[PDB]
């Protein structure tokens, strides 16, 4: 995803905030990595990038990796808003407004949460991109991929 500069630190186990609380919850036992790199050219133009939207409020803190794509009307008052945007009614969608000369705390930052999930399944995704050569006719140590 692409977020503000200041919301990168929120993407971390045991942290709070706005994106970490109401956009994407990193569990306290999150396994993997968070990688944030700048895409100020790739995202922000002089006119602004407005295909990105971020949630700011939700009924409760989002569960770890629980996704809420719905644009539902939020009711936390005395009477419901019945779909329309009325009094004490906010649409939970707002765009960042990326610009190419933005301050470091507001430039479009690509944050990627590479999560590793282990369940009662095989390790069907691995990273064994490490091979030697194959020199022969010597008493050597060999390991043909677990062999």
């Amino acid at each position, epitope marked *: 995803f692409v977020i503000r500069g200041n919301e990168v630190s929120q993407i971390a186990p045991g942290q709070t905030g706005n994106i970490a609380d109401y956009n994407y919850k990193l569990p306290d036992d999150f396994t993997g990595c968070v990688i944030a790199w700048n895409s100020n050219k790739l995202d922000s133009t*002089v006119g*602004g990038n407005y295909n990105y939207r971020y949630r700011l409020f939700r009924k409760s803190k989002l569960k770890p990796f629980e996704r809420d794509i719905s644009t539902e009307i939020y009711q936390a008052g005395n009477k419901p808003c019945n779909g329309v945007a009325g009094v004490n009614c906010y*649409f939970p969608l707002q*765009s960042y*407004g990326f610009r190419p000369t933005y301050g470091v705390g507001h430039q479009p930052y690509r944050v990627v949460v590479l999560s590793f999930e282990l369940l009662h399944a095989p390790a069907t995704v691995c990273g064994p991109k490490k091979s030697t050569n194959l020199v022969k006719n010597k008493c050597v140590n060999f390991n043909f991929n677990g062999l």
Partner: antibody
Amino acid sequence: VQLVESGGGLIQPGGSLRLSCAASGIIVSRNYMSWVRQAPGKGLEWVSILYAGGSSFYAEPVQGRFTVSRDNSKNTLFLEMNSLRVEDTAVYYCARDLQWGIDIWGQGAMVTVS
Amino acid sequence: DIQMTQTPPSLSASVGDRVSISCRASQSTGSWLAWYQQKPGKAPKLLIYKTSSLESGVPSRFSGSGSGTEFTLTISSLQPDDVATYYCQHYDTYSSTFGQGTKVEIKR
């Protein structure tokens, strides 16, 4: 689509400053036009908005002091502010607003009250 | 309904200054005026209840005071974090209202 802001400057407390904002690439009479001031060191403060139908809504702190308007012939957003307080100084942005919220901002106009 | 004011509309002072703001109403309340603080982009935080006793966590520099139509908020020392909007909040079992607020900023 660009929003060029001008008229922001230094004004004594309780004074009156008039902010102009040329709009290019779109007609503001058919667009929500909001004034969102970001205080230096603080966040954006969506203080004023004028719909496409001529209806205007103002934040209570600026309500009764700030009026939002437009010149359709000049296609220029206009913020008329009076009885300014010391707390009104900010980088104001005239901004297009849509269903997803604000869509196009400006280069920024510096308004200082002291 | 409820129409009460605060004074001054704009306040400016340096670090360590004393702050005495006022909330005033046309009639007598006696038992139900409170003080709250709000910063740009944040929710109100209760400062004073009963206009004389400090809410839990509100610093000794902060102090309500006053009686009658007027309500004198005495911040014993204006710290930078005290720079915010001060609202008189009123309790009632129905609609109620929020005040205009006293917006204190840095004098320069």
